[PDB]
Write a protein that binds this DNA or RNA. Structure first.
Lengths: 206, 204
DNA sequence: CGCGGAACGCGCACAGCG
DNA sequence: CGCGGAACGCGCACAGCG
């Protein structure tokens, strides 16, 4: 009912920690262990998980493959999302080649407008003009990796929204404007850099 | 409240960007309501985000704000950067043409024999074993882009070398001494955040 | 007229159950 | 015995003033 987004980010962290624990053969963990690895209090963990259910065992703890399964469900990773990359520049090309996507995310789109790229056969696929967006997105692409130069970002967004996209992972440094019907998440490395600058200059604060 | 919420610093970064665009458009005067509009926040928050540092208001001269903001964020100096992990991302970052005058790449490290010794925009790749010799006095921030499984270790090495801040791109929670700052850029996390958001539209 | 404190909404102790 | 509600604390109202 409450469900702060700060909690969704932490759930991501717990699932990753669970995958890792599983990889090490651990069968059972606890909020205390989980907190120690996610660098938060055990309270924060139990409270974050409580927003969705009671997956543990009182007096005992949490069975790793169970909670793991439960978090993947909540996070909507128990499905196979359709992805497309708009802006086959350098970052987008690195992305196309990222091997750590896993079962939950599948690349189906590849786009851009530059003639010198359009038509290049990328990893399992081929680039194409962003004009084919209206005829590519519906029912096959839900999420788009927006990676274009800061000035083409807002333009590319409109296009994507019109083509029926449901989510935009924005890599461009700028606040996008989209219908509130479309979810957007920013991945801003320059903002992070700037934050590091500030953090350094203000050690006390940090 | 003399203690600045960190969320306010994300907004200042956004304000600065909005100013640069203005200046670039030729505008000379802006307002609380104008900034908010462009930043999608209330004019209140803008004023509040600014009050933590001063009264730059008359008011609000784009160039006087752009300048005070970059001073507040520490962009008024030339930070030294290095990249640890020269794979696809490390390479992409190495050739990024938009750091600006505030961030300078002075190092590129790795362990792959095929990569070290390799020339790059701004220098050459060197083995991480050389960080203790390359960091002090020249490099404050490190762009960490190694595989997930080697992140912590690379981080342990940067710490040992005396690094001030790590911009972590690996999907892991780095463990570092308190005097070392860490900022994460997690796109897999954004992806999974979007996944959740799509399924919980009323939650929005 | 137009544009730099304080209230308010939201993010630990014990009850519950194995 | 061992490990899933409510207090606390962080993030609008008006005064000044051209």
């Amino acid at each position: 009912m409450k469900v702060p987004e700060a909690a969704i980010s932490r759930l991501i962290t717990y699932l990753r920690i669970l995958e890792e624990l599983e990889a090490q053969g651990v069968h059972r963990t606890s909020s205390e262990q989980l907190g120690e690895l996610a660098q938060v209090t055990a309270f924060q963990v139990r409270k974050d998980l409580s927003y969705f259910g009671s997956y543990g065992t009182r007096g005992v703890g949490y069975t790793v493959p169970v909670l793991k399964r439960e978090l993947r469900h909540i996070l909507g990773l128990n499905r196979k999302w359709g992805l497309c990359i708009v802006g086959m520049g350098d970052l987008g090309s690195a992305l196309a080649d990222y091997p750590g996507f896993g079962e939950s995310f599948e690349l189906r789109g590849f786009f851009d407008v530059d003639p010198e790229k359009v038509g290049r056969p990328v990893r399992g696929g081929v680039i194409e003009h962003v004009d084919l967006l209206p005829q590519r997105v519906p029912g096959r692409i839900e999420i788009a990796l927006l990676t274009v130069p800061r000035e083409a970002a807002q333009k590319a967004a409109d296009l994507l929204v019109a083509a029926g996209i449901k989510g935009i992972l924005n890599f461009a440094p700028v606040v996008l404007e989209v219908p509130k019907e479309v979810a957007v998440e920013n991945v801003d490395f320059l903002a992070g850099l700037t934050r590091l600058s500030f953090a350094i200059l203000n050690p006390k604060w940090r």
